[PDB]
Amino acid sequence: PGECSVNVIPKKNLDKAKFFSGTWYVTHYLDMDPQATEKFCFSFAPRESGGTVKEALYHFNVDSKVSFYNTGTGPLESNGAKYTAKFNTVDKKGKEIKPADEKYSYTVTVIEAAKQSALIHICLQEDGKDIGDLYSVLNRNKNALPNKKIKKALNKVSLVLTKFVVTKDLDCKYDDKFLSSWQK
Ligand code: HEM
């Protein structure tokens, strides 16, 4: 039911310093649950050091106008483009307002990255079992379209970009300061 997609392949030789820097916006997303129709905006600031990823996450529920903040931490796989994180909930100033629930995790795979674009996949789990998954197209610019290389990657696993929700058309509110100040 909440089974995560197969054939999610980590990019070979992802440039760590480039990917794990700055702020990424989700320009297009595809939630593999067809009934997940609430509109969201998302941005994050992933960082890596000594084999451990530490990232700040920002969601904005467009339906409800409520934003939420998390931080995630986990080991980067030897392949250098996949990681499984545990997450807490923080407030806008970075202070923990709810501890990590040990029964939850998520696994990020960076499928492709090109110029200012990337394609990632996220598998959400509870007690090590799949509970849902989503593909996201990332860009450094919220208003930009993906590089063709990102399209090729989508096409390799029989996904088409037209199926994705386009976020630039939504009434997104972003907390950019939360992400830009991450680990400063
Ligand atoms: C635009 C793309 C995305 C959409 C539409 C989306 C959608 C959602 C939704 C609907 C929820 C549940 C919210 C609720 O319980 O009210 C959620 C939760 C969550 N998502 Fe996302 N997501 C996106 C991207 C991501 C990414 C890229 C990551 C990881 C890097 C991520 C990690 C999480 C985490 C950690 C939660 C925690 C839920 C909780 O605290 O209960 N999401 N997302």
Author numbering: 2 to 185
Paper lines:
The X-ray structure of NP7(E27V) was solved in order to examine the impact of the Glu27 mutation on the structure of the heme cavity. Data collection and refinement statistics of two X-ray structures solved for NP7(E27V) at pH 6.8, the aquo form and the complex with heme-bound imidazole (IMH), are provided in Supporting Information Table S1. The overall fold of NP7(E27V) closely resembles the 3D skeleton of wt NP7, as noted in the Root Mean Square Deviation (RMSD) values for the protein backbone (upon exclusion of the first three and last four residues) close to 0.2 Å for the two NP7(E27V) structures relative to the wt NP7. The AB and GH loops in NP7(E27V) closely fit the arrangement found in wt NP7 solved at both pH 5.8 and 7.818. However, this can be explained by the reduced conformational flexibility imposed by the head-to-tail arrangement of proteins in the crystal lattice, which involves numerous salt bridges between the clustering of Lys residues at the rear surface of the protein, and the negative charges located at the heme mouth. In contrast, NMR studies showed that NP7(E27V) mainly contains B-heme, although a significant fraction of A-heme was also found (ratio A:B of 1:3 at pH 5.5), thus revealing some degree of heme rotational disorder. Note that breakage of the Asp32-Ile132 HB was found even at the acidic conditions used in crystallization (pH 5.5), as was also found for the X-ray structure of wt NP79, suggesting that this structural feature likely reflects the disturbing effect caused by the head-to-tail electrostatic interactions in the crystal. The close resemblance between the X-ray structures of wt NP7 and NP7(E27V) may be misleading for interpreting the functional behavior of NP7 in solution, as key structural details, such as the heme orientation, the spatial layout of the AB loop, and the absence of a HB between Asp32 and Ile132 may be affected by the packing. However, the increase in the apparent rate of the bimolecular phase observed for wt NP7 as the pH is lowered to 5.5 is smaller for NP7(E27V) and becomes negligible for NP7(E27Q), indicating that annihilation of the negative charge of Glu27 upon mutation reduces the pH sensitivity of the ligand rebinding process.
